[PDB]
Amino acid sequence: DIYSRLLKDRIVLLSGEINDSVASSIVAQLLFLEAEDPEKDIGLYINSPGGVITSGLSIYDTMNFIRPDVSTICIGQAASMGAFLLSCGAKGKRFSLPHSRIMIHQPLGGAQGQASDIEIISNEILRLKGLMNSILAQNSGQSLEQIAKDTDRDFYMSAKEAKEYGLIDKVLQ
């Protein structure tokens, strides 16, 4: 298996939308690689349009949970939760290829039912919005105010601009 062979070289590859099923495969490979060697770095290639917030969080925390440094490399694109994960890579090891596009924004969701159940969902999504904005401000060096401002609507940017915004460290020419 091609993918399984790259894993042998410590490469994981995200690709596609993010949900529980996809997140659990990523986490497993991260934990696996840690078992096989807790010191050797890991290359997590990301080409994603985003996905379920909590699914992405599980990946984010597993990354910081294991010992090996987990570098991130954006190919194609990294939007929504895709960009969040790209910025969460090991400091100094967050990369992207020249023509990738990166996009950050605020949470999207849904609620229906009693006004009481809706306030509860709205509140919970708002809590997630603030949590990710702070972590995002934290990973890029931007102030919480600037992130909140720029993610109100889709904010698309090239790999160069993403590097200058603090999202990534280097762009491989």
Partner: peptide
């Protein structure tokens, strides 16, 4: 779910 909730995607963001």
């Amino acid at each position: 779910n909730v995607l963001g």
